[PDB]
A paper describes a structure:
Here, we employ a bidirectional F420‐reducing [NiFe] hydrogenase from the archaeon Methanosarcina barkeri MS (MbFRH) as a unique model system to yield structural and spectroscopic insights into a scarcely explored reaction intermediate that is the initial target for H2 binding to the active site of the enzyme. Each asymmetric unit contains three subunits, FRH‐A, FRH‐B, and FRH‐G, and a total of four [4Fe4S] clusters as well as a flavin adenine dinucleotide (FAD) cofactor and the [NiFe] active site (detailed below). The FAD and the heterobimetallic [NiFe] center enable the redox conversion of the two substrates, coenzyme F420 and H2, respectively, while the [4Fe4S] clusters mediate intramolecular electron transfer (ET) between the two reaction sites. These features are shared with the related [NiFe] hydrogenase from Methanothermobacter marburgensis (Mm), and both enzymes exhibit a dodecameric overall architecture in a spherical shape.2 Compared to the latter enzyme, however, MbFRH contains two additional cofactors that are both ET‐accessible and solvent‐exposed: a [2Fe2S] cluster bridging two FRH‐G subunits and a mononuclear Fe site in FRH‐A.
IR spectra of MbFRH crystals reveal CO and CN stretching bands at 1945 and 2065/2080 cm−1, respectively, which resemble the IR fingerprint of the Nia‐S state of several [NiFe] hydrogenases.6a In particular, these vibrational frequencies are close to those observed for the as‐isolated regulatory hydrogenase from Ralstonia eutropha (ReRH), which is a spectroscopically valuable yet structurally unexplored reference system for the Nia‐S state. Specifically, a peculiar seesaw‐shaped geometry with trans S−Ni−S angles approaching 120° and 180° was postulated to be mandatory for thermodynamically favorable binding of H2 to Nia‐S.16 In line with this proposal, the [NiFe] active site of MbFRH exhibits trans S−Ni−S angles of 107° and 171°, thereby structurally confirming this unusual geometry of the Nia‐S state. Notably, four‐coordinate NiII sites, as found in Nia‐S, typically exhibit (distorted) square‐planar or tetrahedral coordination geometries. This indicates that the atypical seesaw geometry of this [NiFe] intermediate is dictated by the four‐cysteinate coordination pattern and the protein matrix of [NiFe] hydrogenases.
Author numbering:
A (entry chain G), D (entry chain G): 18 to 270
B (entry chain A): 2 to 438
C (entry chain B), E (entry chain B): 1 to 291
F (entry chain A): 294 to 438
């Protein structure tokens, strides 16, 4: 089989998503060596225009008043088999939800939307910053989905399904996810995972129940993602020891 | 003994039921009045939230008395952090408070009159009906509530869930024009509430002279001591309230303890008496299991280890040694509170400086100390207690008037024919969303 | 009742200017917006009104509930950046104790009031207490940073020296207190416009009781539309009381011909924008509040 | 024609919605006199069980762990031609979004949802408290929809359409509506209406743009509702003088 | 590898108790959860572990990262209310500087760890640093107010006097320090259970490395499942090192027969609940996290 | 002028260079300039980072307090803080009152370096203009914020 073709597309992002990918260290070099060709990434390489990609890792949101940005995100959908919203800005808007214009030297750059409001998104990788391990798992599994035996492609499709469901669920992320869709649904069981995942310490547990500092929350969508009562896909997660060994072998020298 | 159950109660705020053991004559031997309103849980969700947010959430406990929770919650925060608000903020809060008492007592006139008789006759008031004298009574009540809500909106920012109160005082003083408008309305209201008060007292006196009332086509005897209980009363002020900031607070937190319904309510029973003719839809089906200890949605606050009565009669008994008890005495005491509301508004307006400061210059953030504030809500003593630290609520507790009155009214049910148990209940002017919060 | 497809519904259109010489000293145009609100206050049609007062930075407006003639006059002259007039709409009926609220503002602010009157959403008491609205013509607006950039850079003027600003004859004009004049071609200002203005389908404040603006009238004069029954009662009385000089608009150059054409260009350009929102993405579009 | 039949159903509400209806004063009495019969309202009348209704005004949210409540809201859909979510608790959850259980004497009463998550809702009346005038307009227009000439029923259907669209849009309400669906969409024009509608003063404008104190916001959905860039239905709103006179005549003696 | 449809995947199941007499003095059952974590620390399989320590109210647990034998032993005994163990999972790898994190908790907490290992969502460094999980059996849990209500009302005991609590033989048991015993029928406790426990489809901590609990074993003993390669390496070494007495489970009464039956009742009852969520409304349902 | 997305901070009325060479020039009078000098100065900063960490760890008290006992809420006074980010002086300025930010401003290293690097382009063959740029280690998301 061939290596799949992967691009990193940079919209209104901070490059922390790219840094997260790079923080797989020799893992990334192993993937680039054996499974994937980086065909486009302005930060790392000199390909100036968006080429065709099997997988586009798209970070950042879209500024509606920046013509080239709107064209880039449409061109990306047109050029890509699989579009991945990489990180919470691409998935959910994140800190650019708060953008409201008025700053030099483009006071009209006022409106930012997650990429899923402008194009169809196949896969979400939520997180701010996203976990290096997640970006790696998704790249490996995308390779298996495209180049593996049908036993692998079956595993890969089952692994990615909840990240594809997230992309179909919507383009909003907030502390309030845990109210709306977990506590208010009768699904919260007080494990406290949301509090560990929150990057800004906006979540405490009081008598076993989430308490959200909404004016600290930066709307990244991490806590609903990590909650074991958002998606819990038993067919994958109960096979954790096996899937771990499979991923590890794919990275071994 | 048989067991009959009315579920739901009607012509009161919110969701409760009456689970009653009755003797061979249908007289209550032991009845439980209990909340079955779901516990929205305001005290627990408050923990970690900002001291600015919690009073505005607590307001949404109840849309009839939101003034009571907005002010008691805010003043509990102010008491915990040691914040002294400016005079003109206090005056505006008192105007807001008195206005709301008018609207609430007048609303309760609408709820209770269908049980009462046009004096000297056998016709009961039907206030829906476009006929006299009901329609002229409705027109007066309706103007009274309109005036009251208007004053509340001007001084408090909103008639339902007032927006003007904040930690440290108020967002806004009022204009010279608004001050004149509140005075003009209070002058009008004072004449109206004097008329409504005399009307209601006449209707109640006629009730006290009746031997029976009609329920579902049957004559139900009226006991002389209807609604009597031996729990005594509790009150913190005749009008506004008290807080732990005061030199001599008028409420004693070492005398309070809150239990579960467990200590005071009956356990499991089975309904074996049913009346399908009870207006309108009948009583609980024979064979239904009930368990007041477990179904009751409230806690039970006590004072000196016992339930107490709160509300207008409690206030008049505490502060003027009013010496009548029971159902019609409760009704009387409530109507008698109408004029104080209008004189208070006018006196407060007379002292209000519309250029005066309404926010304390310094708002401390709290060190975890406990403070408390009592507001004399229309239904009785509403006590909020709080520990604020670094601007966050670390501990919160709410002892709401109807919470206090639930076990007390239950005990007052003894001796009533079960078909007018609901009349005993309505003299407490119940707010079951308040009691549960 | 004329029902014009670009100038909205109105009873008459005249060219007018206030007879109050104090008002005219600092009015942008004819002094219609100030004269109408002062007169409404002194006659008792309103007991207060929302006007764009002076704010905390030079040429930045601050909404305020004015209740005296003197406070109304402080709001004279056009501030070409955002003034959130409607933020005091409910409060005017609370702590201010007003029974008869006046509102001044541009076309979208007139729309906000009418929406509040018909669909009050946590706007209790507002429907019945709105007493009088005067709407300004408005082609587009700017953030304050946009306005600083235009005046300080493009016109090279100090904001603290500016006496008047004016968009007319294809140029953004800056007049200084010491008597100098600078201009900027409107083409240079386009990047700075507030983006939300680009879906606006309303030029001459279609929904106001009385609408007033500059285009169609000579300098020092205003083009005025009298639209509603409220608007006609007040205007008739004011004219009868000597408050205004008038000229029928069709005796005035360039008049309604130019004005109807500028209204048409605004609506057509912005309706196109509204249309392109629908297919803005790939197999996806942006929201249309008018849908 | 007959009077339509109207009930007030009380779920986990505060009765402030009912008080708002009552604060139409002689307006309500006029409606009850001439256009509608109140067939059910536990606060005001002794009908113990939910009867058939043309219009059910439903206030409050639904506690999922309270059996009788769940049965009530299903029975209400079954018994009603038109279901109106009256007020922000019924529409959007409002303060009961924050409920998380743990309080005596039902620590398991943990989960609350707006009624639209349990039944289909025809019409939203958002607000906390809802405006008396809005509840009145909706009752009048519902009468015209059911009993008027076809010119009236056409007006009534056009008036109610945006309140029906709100019910189809979703069951969430928050300050963040103005970010997600107005500012982030390129539709905000700085009018400041949201700041006037907010019942808790959580909204300021900074340089002409909304600024939200999310830890003060009680999630009532009022500000998006009132914003003239949520729904602006020109066919109705430009006829404001006419529709005003029509409503007023229907209330006149 | 047995693959049981109600007891999950495991290599063996024995009945066991620690040989450390200090540990057993206050262990709930066999002292397996404490003995396994102490041994793992002293052998270097972990450098710290998340345990349910003592909190600020009597019998309210507080999660804590323990890094000494003494801190691990403070977590002995069952607290039947919520302890949000996973809230320290990421922090254990940050300010604590751990390379080999242990986690103790009930079945849903084991699930949380495995989800974090496979789908880390703002859980950087956690997948590769989880070194050892010990899962407790768990039929259901309670809020703290629920636990107060059960102990103080139904059992009539003061929380400050309680030495041990135990759900067994159809009753909630309370043991006091001065030697008294009170019981409550489990039927009385049902209203108090945490509602989110009612969709739980996991009884014997299926996803842990080693799972341990009481049912199936006599008093003072634990039923233990050794499940993963991590779990088998540590258990083998510990047994070889003298840390545990064991008995094959099938030589023990009531053993795996009763246990598999209680697991089946839990899953069947909660699977039904999960099914009813789907049609909970009219033409609408509630969310299924398992869908 | 119109497409540029940044503001232009100046010092004594002129653009300045910030970053590793700026730090070595200011604090050791490093006296080489231009593209390769910038590259040199950046590499020379590697060891200070590790010696500093080790010295800080040596002085760190792991039982010591890490939060001030009192956090005032502010009266609207202006304060500022400079951080020497890897690309140069990062200056944030703020007025806090009652725990809220009333005024905020950010002068970020690449913001400063944008006009300065532009001027350094004179004399370069246009095909290695990008090499002149890269010696500034640009962070354009930083410069724009
Ligand atoms: C952004 C803006 C764009 C405009 N575009 C046009 C145009 O294209 N064509 C045209 O003919 N006229 C336009 N106008 C109107 C014109 O500039 C004058 O404001 C109008 O003729 C009223 O002048 P006057 O002499 O009657 O009012 P004056 O007596 O000088 O009183 C000024 C009035 O304008 C209001 N006002 C001033 N600034 C604002 C503001 N930022 N926001 C809301 N209300 C304000 C004040 O409250 C006051 O009521 C615009 C106005 C504004 C604010
Ligand atoms: C809510 C709960 C329900 C349970 N239901 C059952 C059951 O139905 N059947 C059965 O056989 N066993 C059940 N158990 C397990 C049993 O009660 C013992 O905890 C188990 O046998 C381990 O005991 P031990 O002697 O090995 O541990 P010990 O040496 O006494 O150590 C106690 C361990 O339990 C952990 N722990 C204690 N309380 C909690 C808590 N609230 N939350 C998370 N972790 C905690 C501690 O961190 C520590 O690791 C339950 C435990 C809990 C917390
Ligand atoms: N009055 C009153 Fe409320 Ni609706 C009660 N009970 C409380 O404070
Ligand atoms: N180094 C650095 Fe940043 Ni990405 C820049 N420029 C800033 O502070
Ligand atoms: S998701 Fe976070 S790390 Fe990724 S581009 Fe957005 S701000 Fe940066
Ligand atoms: S992670 Fe999910 S289930 Fe666990 S405490 Fe947070 S909201 Fe509740
Ligand atoms: S609470 Fe924390 S994890 Fe959840 S969306 Fe907000 S910032 Fe992200
Ligand atoms: S162009 Fe329209 S949206 Fe913009 S300020 Fe003028 S009236 Fe408002
Ligand atoms: S929407 Fe507001 S006023 Fe209506 S029931 Fe809910 S808290 Fe009460
Ligand atoms: S009401 Fe709407 S358009 Fe007006 S300022 Fe608020 S969000 Fe922007
Ligand atoms: S910001 Fe105010 S109006 Fe908007 S949803 Fe929150 S509380 Fe309601
Ligand atoms: S029954 Fe399940 S959800 Fe509840 S505490 Fe036990 S393992 Fe967690
Ligand atoms: S979803 Fe708004 S905090
Ligand atoms: Fe309470
Ligand atoms: Fe800057």
């Amino acid at each position: 089989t061939n290596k799949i073709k992967i691009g990193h597309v940079h919209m209104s992002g901070c490059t922390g998503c790219l840094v997260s990918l790079a923080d797989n260290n020799l893992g990334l070099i192993k993937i680039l060596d054996d499974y994937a060709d980086l065909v486009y990434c302005l930060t790392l390489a000199d390909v100036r225009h968006i080429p065709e990609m099997d997988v586009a890792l798209v970070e950042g949101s879209v500024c509606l008043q920046d013509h080239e940005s709107v064209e880039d995100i449409k061109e990306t959908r047109k050029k890509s088999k699989i579009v991945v919203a990489l990180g919470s800005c691409a998935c959910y808007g994140n800190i650019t939800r708060f953008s409201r214009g008025g700053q030099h030297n483009q006071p009209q750059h006022e409106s930012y939307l997650p990429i899923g409001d402008l194009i169809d998104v196949d896969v979400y990788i939520p997180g701010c910053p996203p976990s290096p391990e997640l970006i790696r798992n998704v790249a490996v599994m995308a390779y298996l989905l495209l180049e593996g035996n049908e036993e692998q492609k079956e595993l890969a499709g089952k692994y990615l399904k909840p990240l594809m469901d997230l992309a179909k669920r919507g383009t909003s992320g907030c502390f309030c996810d845990l109210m709306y869709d977990v506590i208010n649904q009768g699904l919260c069981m007080g494990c406290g995972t949301c509090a560990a995942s929150c990057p800004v310490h906006a979540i405490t547990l009081e008598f076993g129940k989430p308490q959200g500092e909404r004016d600290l929350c930066i709307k990244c969508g991490s806590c609903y993602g990590a909650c074991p009562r958002s998606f819990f896909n038993l067919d994958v997660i109960s096979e954790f020891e096996n899937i771990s060994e499979i991923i590890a072998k794919a990275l071994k020298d | 003994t048989k067991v009959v159950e009315i579920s739901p109660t009607t012509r009161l705020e919110g969701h409760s039921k009456l689970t009653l053991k009755v003797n061979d004559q249908g007289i209550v031997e032991r009845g439980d009045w209990l909340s079955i309103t779901p516990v929205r849980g305001i005290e627990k969700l408050a923990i970690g939230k900002t001291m600015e947010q919690v009073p505005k959430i607590a307001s949404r406990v109840c849309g009839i008395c939101p003034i009571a929770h907005t002010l008691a919650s805010t003043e509990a925060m102010e008491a915990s952090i040691g914040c002294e608000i400016p005079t003109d903020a206090k005056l505006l809060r008192i105007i807001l408070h008195a206005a709301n008492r008018i609207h609430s007592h007048a609303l309760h006139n609408i709820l209770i009159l269908p049980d009462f008789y046009i004096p000297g006759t056998e016709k009961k008031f039907n206030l829906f009906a476009n006929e006299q004298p009901a329609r002229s009574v409705m027109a007066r009540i309706v103007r009274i509530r309109e005036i009251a809500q208007t004053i509340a909106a001007i001084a408090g920012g909103e008639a339902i869930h007032p927006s003007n109160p904040r930690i440290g005082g108020m967002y806004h003083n009022v204009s010279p024009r608004a001050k004149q408008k509140m005075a003009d309305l209070a002058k009008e209201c004072l004449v109206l509430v004097h008329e409504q008060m005399e009307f209601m007292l006449d209707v109640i006196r006629n009730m006290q002279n009746r031997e029976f009332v009609e329920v579902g086509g049957k004559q139900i005897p009226l006991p002389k001591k209807l609604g009597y209980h031996n729990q005594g009363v509790m009150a913190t002020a005749p009008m506004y309230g008290s807080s732990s900031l005061d030199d001599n607070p008028t409420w004693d937190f070492t005398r309070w303890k809150e239990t579960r319904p467990w200590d005071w309510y009956m356990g499991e029973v089975t309904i074996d008496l049913e009346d399908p003719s009870y207006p309108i839809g009948g009583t609980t089906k024979v064979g239904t299991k009930a368990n007041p200890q477990m179904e009751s949605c409230t806690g039970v606050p006590t004072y000196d280890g016992q339930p107490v009565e709160v509300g207008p009669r409690a206030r008049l008994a505490t502060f003027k040694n009013f010496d009548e008890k029971g159902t019609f005495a409760q009704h009387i005491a409530r109507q008698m509170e109408y004029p104080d509301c209008c004189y208070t508004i006018l006196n407060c307006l007379d002292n209000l400086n519309t250029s005066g400061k309404v926010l304390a210059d310094h708002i401390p953030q709290g060190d975890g100390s406990m403070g408390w504030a009592a507001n004399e809500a229309p239904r009785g003593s509403n006590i909020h207690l709080a520990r604020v630290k670094d601007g966050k609520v670390r501990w919160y507790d709410m002892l709401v008037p109807t919470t206090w009155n639930f076990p007390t009214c239950s005990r007052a049910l003894t001796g009533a024919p079960w078909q007018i148990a609901e009349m005993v209940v309505r003299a407490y002017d119940p707010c079951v969303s308040c009691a549960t919060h | 009742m004329i029902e014009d497809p670009y100038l909205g519904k109105y009873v008459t259109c005249v060219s007018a200017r206030s007879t109050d010489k104090e008002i005219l000293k600092k009015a942008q145009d004819g002094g219609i917006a100030t004269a109408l609100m002062v007169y409404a206050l002194e006659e008792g049609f309103i007991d207060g009104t929302i006007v764009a007062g002076e704010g905390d930075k030079p040429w930045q407006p601050k909404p305020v509930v004015a209740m005296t003639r003197e406070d109304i006059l402080k709001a004279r002259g056009t501030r070409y950046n955002i003034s959130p007039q409607i933020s005091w709409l409910k409060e005017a009926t609370r702590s201010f104790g007003l029974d008869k609220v006046g509102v001044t503002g541009v076309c979208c602010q007139m729309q906000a009031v009418r929406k509040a009157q018909l669909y009050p959403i946590n706007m209790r008491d507002v429907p019945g207490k709105v007493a009088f609205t005067v709407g300004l013509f408005c082609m587009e607006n700017f953030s304050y940073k946009s306005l600083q950039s235009i005046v300080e850079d493009h016109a090279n003027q100090s904001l603290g020296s500016v006496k008047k600003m004016e968009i007319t004859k294809g140029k953004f004009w800056v007049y200084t207190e010491r008597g100098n004049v600078a201009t900027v071609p409107l083409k240079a200002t386009h990047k700075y416009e507030q983006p939300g203005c680009h879906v606006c389908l309303d030029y001459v404040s279609n929904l106001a009781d009385i609408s007033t603006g500059s285009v169609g009238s000579p300098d020092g004069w205003s083009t005025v539309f009298i639209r509603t029954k409220v608007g006609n009662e007040i205007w008739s009385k004011a004219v009868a009381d000597g408050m205004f000089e008038t000229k029928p608009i069709e005796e005035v150059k360039p008049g309604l011909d130019l004005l109807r054409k500028l209204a048409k260009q605004k609506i057509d350009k912005n309706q196109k924008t509204v249309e392109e929102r629908k297919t803005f993405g790939i197999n996806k579009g942006l929201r249309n509040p008018y849908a």
